[PDB]
Each structure stands twice: as C-alpha cells, then as structure tokens.
Design brief:
The structure is cut from a larger assembly and holds three copies of chain A, one copy of chain B, one copy of chain E and one copy of chain F. By secondary structure, chain A is mainly α. Chain A contains two helices and no strands. Chain E is an all-alpha fold. In chain E, helix 1 runs antiparallel to helix 2. Chain F is built from seven helices and 13 strands. In chain F, the strands form three sheets. In chain F, strands 1, 2, 3, 4, 5 and 12 form a six-stranded antiparallel β-sheet that branches. Classes of the chains: A mainly alpha, B alpha+beta, E mainly alpha, F alpha+beta. Chains in contact: A-B, B-C, B-E, B-F, C-D, C-F, D-F, E-F. At the B-F interface, helix 6 and strand 13 of B face strand 1, strand 4 and helix 7 of F. The PDB classes it as virus. The entry lists the keywords murine cytomegalovirus, human cytomegalovirus, pp150, pU11, pM32. The entry is titled "Atomic structure of the Human Herpesvirus 6B Capsid and Capsid-Associated Tegument Complexes". Chains A, C, D are Major capsid protein.
C-alpha cells in the first residue's frame, strides 16, 4: 500500500545499519511487508 | 499519435489495480479516432453481439491495434503503433514468447469461465491473444477440425477424439481448446468456414475436369498429365453414373467457376495470418518483451 | 577390489600479497551511450 | 529390464531417436532429492 | 493404350523432371511412330529407368516386372497370345 | 544566388536537426548544487534517438560459429530445440548451406571441413531428424559484434543498416556465390534491388532435402516474385506434387520466400572468404537496410 509514497516522499538519512545480506533478507523474506523492483519502474508516476 | 479513453461507469480500486496490472496490452479499436469511450473500447462490442469467428477473424485483421502506455487518474493513454519502430508488449497469453518470433492476434478462446479482466455493467473487456504464428496456424486447424467433426453423429469415440483435438501442447504449456461437445458458451460455430471448405473440395474436381477435357492439342504438356494423375488417384472410379450424363451449360460452368472463386476470396480471412509484431528481446521471467511493429 | 575416488569442494578464504606498483592500468575517461527502447531508455557507461 | 530393476532404474532407455541427440547435446538430469542434509556428493569407480 | 501410356507417362515425366533423357524422349517419339520392331529394340534401355525408380540405387534386374508370379503369368499370357492371336 | 552561403545554411540546419534528435533541452530548475560531471551530463543529456537500428543480444555456444567469429555480417538462424536448457540455438547460413542441396560437392565438403566437430554434428543430426525445416529453424537477422568469450555473444540486426556503434565500417551481408541467383529478364534493372531468401525443398526418393536460395530482383511486389519463382521452379514443383500426397510428413508447400531488405546496385561486389585457408567465393552485398517481411509460401 502507498508504494509510490516511499518512492516519492522526503526520507530521513539514516546512518549505516551495518546489516549484512540486504539482498538475502529480502530474498529469504524476513519481512512480511516489502515491495522490491529489479529494474526501474514508472509505477510512481500515475497519481490518481 | 495517442488516444484517450475515459470510462463510462465508476471503477473500483481493484479495477484500477487491474489496469495497473494490465498497463501494457494490445487493444483493438474500430474507429481510427482520438477520443474513444469504454462503450467501444475493446472487442466485446463486436464479438458476442455479432456473427463470430470468421467475420471476427476478418475484423481482427481490419481493426486498429493500439497498445496501452499509461493509466492516469481515471483515463487511459493508448499509443497507436507505427510501422518499423519498437514498442513494448506484456505477455498475457499462455504460450511463452521467445526471441525472433513473429506475433499475431488470434481471437480469444472464449470460454465463459475466464476471469473477465474488466466487467463493468454488461460491458466487459476482451483482448485478442498475442501468439506466435505457428501456434496460430495450429489453433486455426484444430478449430476447423472440431467444427467439422462436431456435426457428424454415431462415432462412438467422439468424446476421446474431441479430447485429442482439444489438447494441444507447445513449449511445455498445455491448453485445452474450449470448444468441447458444443456447450455453446462460445463455440463460435464456424459453419460458413466448414461449409466453404467443403464447397471447395466438392466443386474442385468437376471444374478442373471440364477445363482439362478441352484444348490438349496445344502443347501445354504439363497440366493435362498432372490433372489426370491427381484426379484418378483419389477419385479412382471417376464419374460412372455421371448425374446428368454430360448435359452442361456454358453459363452453368460460368456459375460454377464464379462461385468456387468467390468462396476463396471470402475465406481470405482464414487464408493468412499477418505478423503484427516481431519480438526482438524478451525480459527476464517472461513478463513483457520489447518488439518491433509490422503490418 | 575397487578404488573409489571422490572429490570434495570446500570454502576457503585465501589471502594475497602483491609488491607495489606491480601492474599498471592505462584507462579511459568513461564514455556514455544511450539506447531508446520505447518504454525505457538505457544509459550505458563504458570504460576501457 | 532385469538389470534396470536390480540396480533401481525406472523408465529405461530414454529413446533411440530424439533423446539420444538431446542427452549428447545436454545434461540429462534428474529430479532433486527431497531431503538433503549435507551438500554435494559423487563417487566414481575403478575395478581392481 | 500404348499411345496413351507412352505419351502421358514417359515424355511428361522426363520433361517435368530430370531433363536429361530428352534424347530418349525423341526415341520414344519415334517409338510412337509405327516402327515397332526397332521401337521395341532397347526396351531394356527404357526399362532401366523403371528399375531405378522401383528399387533405389539402380541395378540390372530381369526384364519382366517385379512381382514373381505376375512375371511368370505375363509370359504364360504371351505364349497363349502367340499360339492364338485370334 | 550566393550559393555557398545557402549550402552552409543547409548543412548547419542538418547538424542542428541531428542535435535536436540527439539531446534534450532540460526545463528542470537546474540549481547549482551538483558536481561538474553531473552538470555537463545534465547539459547534454543523451537519448537513444540517434542510431535508429534495431539490434538484439544473443548467446550461442561458440562451437557453431567457425567463420562467423571472424567475418562480420552473416545471416543467422534461430533453431528452437526441445532441450529445456537451451530453448533456442543460433545457426550460420553457411552451417545450414552445408546440407543444403544447391551447393556443389567441392564447396559442400570444403565448408564441412570448416564445420567438423561433435556439437555441429549433433545439431545437424537434430536438423535432419526434424520433419520440415522452415518452422523449426527460422530467419533471424544479420550479424554484427561477435564477442567470442566462453559462450559467444552475438549481436544481430533486425532492422536498419548493419553497424555495432560509431556508425563506422558498416558491414554487409555475405552470401555464398553458389546459392544465390537473380530471376528476372534484365538483372539489375534500374536501381536498388530487394534481396530475398528462398527455401526450396526437394525429395531424392527417401527423404526431403532443403535448398537455400537468395534472390535479388527489382520487383517489390511479393506476388510478382512468387510468380517469377514458380516459372523458375516449375519442374521440381511438379515432382513435389507427386511427393506431397504419398508422404505423410507435416508440410504443405514446395518453398517459401522472405524479404531480407534493400540493397544498392552499385553496392554489389564479388569476393572470397577464407577461414583456415579454405578460399570460398562470395558475393558481398555492401550496404543493406534490413527489413524482414513475412514468410510467403508457394506450393
């Protein structure tokens, strides 16, 4: 929900979290709620 | 040149999400025109309301292909394709696209158990299936076989022979052709197509007979020999009872040839299948592919 | 009798030494090219 | 058929035709073991 | 029937394909001419092509045709005709 | 008039039109934050409206590309395969003209001696065990950019003139001199001719043998070119009329023609290839605007 949001909005710059396997966290799905895109996406440009 | 489509009813959030899933697709359009409503978007204003399959095949040949580009707040941007240039097409059909394949539009295998991509107050959205050309030929031949053998009775293997027609396979993706036992959901009924084929195969031998029985003195030397062979191999006992015992009119022969040539240039639709797209590369996981547009 | 042969593949972390200025890289300023597929245009940076 | 049984092979003699050239053009393969607990293995053989 | 077979089959095969035996087609045009004795001379040479098409990699075979009992019955019929032409 | 001035004006207009197609004016607010590299890239800001040729990257096992890793510009053929691991496989025009029947025995053996290995032998066995040819292997385009790594990367042109990049050394289609022929009353009638590929089958008493022909003619109209090719092939057409009934192999025609694209009359030149010392005569078409039309069969 509201993915175009985090692709668009202001973002607070966070210090390095020092977490290994960011790709692995995602591909193993540690998180219930994630959206990824492998290559660049026009899905944030439609605002209805 | 672009085309705007504004829908007629309201849309649910799930419907707008369906469009965002379908943001690249081919849509046929009747009028080559800038502002089109959902009352004429798609192919359901033609199929299901008017003669089906062969006029549908002629119409899918003659409508305007137009691809979705972007969905606005509630409007559709459809860019119509120019010849010789690249576009991008998403994969809706079941058969896997590969590189260098030619693409064509077949009418949808109109089972009424489909998920009905939009269904907006007695209007629904139907797209043609983009498919490789080899499979399109194979699907056309299987449909004509089903429409031929569905009229015969008293085959006691009719269920298994219709099943062996309906099961086709192409690059490890099976599909069952939904024209089973004449459920009449959309059989498409193809009755002029089979009638036209059998008018051709019945009016052929006597027309080539009445032509070849004349002017052999001239040294054609190839045609006369070939027709005797070709005719007397299959129809080995040729013209015993003769029907009328050789009382023909030149006007009758005129009408025979004129009819048998009308049948061909009116089955022109099932004659050929044009290559609407030549796909150059295919993206990963076979979601969409960048192609070039031809014809 | 028999002599059963068997291979095994390991994981090794494996360190390296190299004396200084052993091998020179002569290189380019990176060049830019662009191709326009009509949904996404790819910009490619090459360097020799 | 007896030897394929008594060493544990089903579906014998993959073809005389197409699967000949297919296998000699590509690895034949097999379904993966459902449970695997220790990694990769293969053991060859010399008679002696 | 000799004219129908010799016309329709022989000339038109060697014209439609394998355009080298047109010298032999001039020979079979003179065979269509009423010079039967000289015509049936070299029926071996115009049988060799039938041998080539009945069996691949052409050999020489006996002059009467492929089926053995039909081959003997042809000769029996020819002796019957030679005894009683009428 | 002045003449020289107007000529310079037209040349400046063409160069500025090339820049208008190449770069894009930016109407971002364009503030002074960025580094100078991003500054000059935001001033230029290329897009790919400049090449206007359509290519495709392709991966092929390098055992099959024996002269074609050296001689840029070749027809290529997509062979789909029932092997899941590689679903498509790419094929040289010469690799398929080996077992084409038009090629004489000396040229056929000479090319084969180029093309002798285990992979190529297995692929030719697969092609022969295929029933027909034209819809198990198919036309794909014209070669540029051979990489020759482990699995060789081939670019291939679907449409436009044949060039990798820089629009320099625009390569040309290389056709084997034996396999091509131009059926028309006047060869090279007035101007630029259309180059076609004709697949013709033949049956020597047991199996089908294919033949790969390339025709060059001034006619654009496909009905006219199949009407001249029936007149060319009327004898063997007759032989297939006898074959296609007694056979049961799923094919329904004698051959098929498909357009490669344009050429130029003065851009036709002879020559020879050589790979591993085998001199091999070719007719090198020089500048080709590749334009694949549909396959059109004739029976």
């Amino acid at each position: 929900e509201n993915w175009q949001a985090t692709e668009i909005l202001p973002k607070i710059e966070a210090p390095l979290n020092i977490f290994n396997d960011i790709k692995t966290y995602t591909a193993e799905q540690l998180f219930d709620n994630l959206r990824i895109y492998f290559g660049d996406d026009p899905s944030r440009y439609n605002i209805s | 040149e672009t085309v705007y489509c504004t829908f007629d009813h309201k849309l649910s959030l799930s419907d707008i999400s369906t469009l965002c899933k379908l943001m690249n697709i081919v849509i046929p359009i009747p009028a080559h025109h800038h502002l089109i409503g959902s009352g004429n978007l798609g192919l359901y204003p033609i199929v299901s309301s008017n003669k089906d399959y062969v006029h549908i095949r002629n119409v899918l040949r003659t409508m305007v292909v137009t691809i979705l580009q972007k969905v606005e707040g509630n409007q559709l941007v459809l860019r119509k394709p120019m010849t010789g240039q690249q576009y991008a097409i998403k994969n809706t059909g079941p058969f896997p696209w590969e590189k260098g394949d030619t693409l064509t539009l077949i009418p949808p295998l109109s089972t009424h158990s489909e998920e009905k991509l939009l269904k907006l107050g007695d209007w629904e959205l139907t797209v043609p299936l983009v498919v490789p050309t080899a499979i399109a030929a194979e699907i056309n031949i299987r449909l004509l076989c089903i429409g031929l053998i569905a009229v015969h009775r008293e085959y006691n293997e009719m269920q298994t022979i219709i099943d062996e027609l309906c099961s086709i396979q192409y690059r490890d993706v099976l599909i069952k052709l939904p024209d089973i036992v004449n459920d009449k959901q959309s059989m498409y009924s193809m009755k002029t197509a089979c009638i036209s084929l059998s008018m051709i195969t019945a009016m052929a031998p006597d027309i080539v007979r009445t032509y070849i029985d004349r002017l052999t003195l001239e040294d054609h030397s190839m045609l006369l020999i070939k027709c005797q062979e070709l005719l007397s191999k299959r129809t080995t006992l040729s013209t015993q009872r003769c029907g009328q015992l050789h009382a023909t009119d030149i006007k009758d022969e005129l009408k025979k040839i004129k009819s048998v040539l009308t049948m061909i240039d009116q089955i022109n639709s099932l004659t050929n299948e044009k290559t609407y797209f030549v796909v150059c590369d295919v993206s990963a996981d076979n979601r969409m592919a960048t192609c070039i547009y031809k014809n | 009798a028999a002599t059963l042969v068997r291979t095994d593949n390991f994981d090794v972390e494996c360190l390296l030494y190299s004396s200084r200025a052993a091998t020179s890289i002569i290189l380019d300023d990176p060049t830019v090219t662009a191709e326009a597929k009509d949904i996404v245009t790819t910009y490619n940076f090459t360097q020799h | 058929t007896w030897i394929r049984h008594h060493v544990g092979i089903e579906k014998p003699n993959p073809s005389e035709g197409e699967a000949l050239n297919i296998i000699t053009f590509g690895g034949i393969n097999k379904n993966p073991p459902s449970i695997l607990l220790h990694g990769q293995q293969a053991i060859c053989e010399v008679i002696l | 029937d000799i004219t129908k077979l010799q016309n329709v089959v022989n000339e038109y095969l060697k014209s439609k394909g394998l355009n080298k035996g047109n010298f032999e087609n001039m020979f079979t045009n003179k065979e269509k001419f009423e010079s039967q004795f000289s015509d049936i001379h070299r029926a071996l040479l115009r049988l060799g092509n039938s041998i080539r098409w009945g069996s691949n990699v052409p050999i020489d075979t006996p002059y009467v045709n492929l089926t053995a009992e039909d081959s003997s019955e042809i000769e029996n019929n020819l002796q019957d005709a030679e005894k009683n032409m009428l | 008039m002045n003449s020289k001035s107007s000529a310079r004006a037209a040349i400046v207009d063409t160069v500025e039109a090339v820049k208008k197609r190449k770069y894009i004016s930016i109407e971002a607010g364009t503030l002074n934050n960025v580094v100078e590299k991003e500054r000059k890239f935001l001033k230029q800001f290329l897009s790919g409206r400049e090449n206007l040729r359509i290519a495709a990257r392709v991966f092929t096992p390098c055992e099959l590309l024996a002269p074609e890793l050296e001689n840029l510009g070749m027809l290529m053929y997509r062979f789909e395969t029932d092997v899941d691991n590689p679903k498509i496989l790419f094929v040289g025009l010469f690799f398929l003209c080996s077992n084409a029947f038009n090629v004489s025995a000396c040229v056929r053996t000479a090319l084969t001696t180029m093309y002798t290995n285990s992979m190529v032998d297995n692929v030719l066995s697969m092609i022969n065990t295929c029933k027909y040819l034209e819809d198990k292997v198919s036309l794909f385009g014209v070669t540029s950019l051979v990489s020759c790594g482990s699995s060789c990367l081939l670019s291939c042109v679907m449409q436009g003139n044949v060039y990798d990049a820089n629009k320099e050394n625009i390569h040309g289609l290389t056709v084997l001199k034996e396999i091509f022929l131009e059926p028309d009353w006047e060869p090279r009638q007035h101007s630029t001719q259309y180059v076609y590929v004709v697949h013709v089958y033949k049956e020597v008493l047991s199996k089908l043998q294919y033949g790969i022909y390339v025709v060059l003619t001034s006619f654009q109209n496909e009905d006219l070119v199949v009407d001249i090719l029936r007149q060319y092939f009327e004898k063997e057409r007759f032989l297939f009329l006898n074959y296609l009934i007694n056979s049961n192999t799923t094919l329904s025609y004698f051959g098929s023609v498909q357009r490669i694209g344009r050429c130029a009359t003065e851009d036709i030149k002879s020559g020879f290839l050589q790979y591993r010392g085998i001199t091999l005569p070719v007719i090198k078409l020089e500048n080709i605007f590749v334009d694949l039309s549909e396959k059109k069969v004739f029976v």
